[PDB]
Structures are given as structure tokens and as C-alpha cells.
Amino acid sequence: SSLPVPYTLPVSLPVGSCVIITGTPILTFVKDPQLEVNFYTGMDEDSDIAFQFRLHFGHPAIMNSCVFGIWRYEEKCYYLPFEDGKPFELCIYVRHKEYKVMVNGQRIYNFAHRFPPASVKMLQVFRDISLTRVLISD
Amino acid sequence: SLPVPYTLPVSLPVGSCVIITGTPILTFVKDPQLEVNFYTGMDEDSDIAFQFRLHFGHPAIMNSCVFGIWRYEEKCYYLPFEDGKPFELCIYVRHKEYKVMVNGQRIYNFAHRFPPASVKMLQVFRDISLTRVLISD
């Protein structure tokens, strides 16, 4: 039913295209389960990354003390309410000057291009997910 | 709805529990959170023995890697549901630690950095409407 993880795919992502990534979080093996998506400008692991998207599936909780006006050593964890992950659709739409990032149809960010979109040659998707679909749409 | 910020003189001996209930407010700021401070005095310039900050959204972090060097991170929070479901935060005072529970789930044991007797004031604020604040034992 799925795709191997890590998943690597040569891609062309011109303006007007969209990367659609769907899957289910795996919340049972690591304390800070996350999704990582990389857009590489070449085919090697050596090459530059035009755009990395990392999404944490938990809620960060940060604890600390303030002594003599100075915050001290931070202690952090990720709160995971439900123990099954909510299936997600990540959509990265390529606009002329930005990537428009949507999670479950909700726009969360507009990331201004730091390389021309045509520089992207390869997509990588990995970490704490069961991968269902990866496609490039228009 | 209790006023926010909510500040309360408290005594938190071993065996007590701070119970805070409310519902997140997700519509005014991009990174809605809950902040709870245990102060060691009544002044706002008092020391904080324990702060608990919870982000109601999911952090998403974006960056580029150029010449092998990660560059400037851009961060945002994904806020699903519709609005946040109500929450219960329980901070149990044990002999050596606070046991932090969210919605009945123990998420963290924070070792005391001050004797719990040092705590004199509780403050609860940021992006919540507050329903109850009580100290039980």
C-alpha cells in the first residue's frame, strides 16, 4: 500500500507545479517524531538543498527556571496526545517567487525561493512516516 | 472565564497538585501557547522556580543548505482541528520533581531546582481562556 522510506525521486518542479505527499505519522519509535522533505539541486547526497521542510508531529513543551533575571537550562519534550497519527497531505506549490506550503489543505507558510525553482533535481522524503503517495501535479 | 493573566499566591508542598483547565485560543497569534510560572516571590522580578510553556500548534521548520552550510531557519506553526480542544494541565509536586501531566498523560518529570517550599506565586497566561485554577492534595 506504501512507498519505501527514505524515498528519493528525481523531480522537475517548475512554477505552477505542486508536490503532493501523503502518509501517516509513526508515533511509536522516537520521542520527537517528524517528517523531513528535502529539495536537492543535484542527484548526490553531496548537493545543495534548495528547500527543506521539517514538521514535528507533537506539541513542544518547554520547561525552565529564571534565576537572577537569567533563564537557565531548557528542558523540552514533545506532547503526543493521540497515540495514532492523523494521516496528512503535504502540498508544496511552486509559485514564481515562493513555495506555498499547505498541510491538510491549510496554507501554513510562503517560503521565498533561494534558488530558481528549476534548480531542483531531486526530492527526498523520510523520517517518522508511513508514505502513501508522492506525486507532482499541475 | 477566569481573568488572564491569572496570578495567585500559592503554597505547593510535596503531595499537592496544580490543576489548570481551559481552552486554547487559536485565532489571534501565529504561535498560540500556554505559559505557567511558579515564582519564588510576589514581585514580577522574582525568580521563577519552574516555567511550563506549551505550544498548541505543530512546529514546521524550513531552511536551505548551500555550500554544505545550513542557512537561516524560517519557522511557523501548523494549527489544525478547528480550534483547540479544552485541556487539563496537572503539575504534581513530588519530593524530587514536578510530574507534568497533560490531559491525563504524564509527559515529563522536571527535577526541582528550588525547594518546592520556595514557590510563593503562580501565574497563568498567554493564549488561553481559563476555566479553573486550583491546588489540590
What would you say this structure looks like, in words?
- Two copies of one chain form a homodimer.
- With 138 residues, chain A is an all-beta fold.
- Chain A has a single domain, classed as Jelly Rolls (Sandwich), CATH 2.60.120.200.
- Helices cover 0% and strands 57% of the residues of chain A.
- The first copy, chain A, has strands at residues 7-10, 18-25, 34-40, 49-56, 59-67, 70-71, 75-79, 88-94, 98-103, 106-112, 122-127, 129-137.
- In chain A, strands 10-9-8-2-12 form a five-stranded antiparallel β-sheet, with no helix packed on it. A four-stranded antiparallel β-sheet of chain A has the order 1-11-3-4, with no helix packed on it. A three-stranded antiparallel β-sheet of chain A has the order 6-5-7, with no helix packed on it.
- In chain A, a hairpin with an 8-residue loop joins strand 3 and strand 4.
- In chain A, 30% of the residues are buried.
Distance between the termini of chain A: 24 Å
SSE order of chain A, one letter for each helix or strand? EEEEEEEEEEEE
Find the count of extended strands of chain A (DSSP E, 2+ residues). Answer: 12
List the domain count of chain A as a whole number.
1
Number of helices of chain A: 0
Chain oligomer state: homodimer
- What is CATH's topology name of chain A? Jelly Rolls
Q: Which CATH class of chain A applies here?
A: Mainly Beta
Give the largest chain-chain interface (CB within 8 Å).
A-B, 37 and 38 residues
Question: Based on the structure given, which CATH architecture of chain A is correct?
Answer: Sandwich
User: Which structural category do the helix and sheet elements of chain A fall into?
Assistant: mainly beta
Please estimate the helix content of chain A.
Answer: under 10%
Proportion of beta-strand residues of chain A:
over 45%
Alpha-carbon Rg of chain A, integer:
17 Å
For the biggest sheet of chain A, the summary is:
5 strands, antiparallel
Strand order of the largest sheet of chain A: 10-9-8-2-12
Structural shape of chain A: globular
Pfam family, one (chain B): Gal-bind_lectin
GO molecular function, one term (chain B): carbohydrate binding
Protein name (chain B): Placental protein 13-like
Subcellular location (chain B): Nucleus
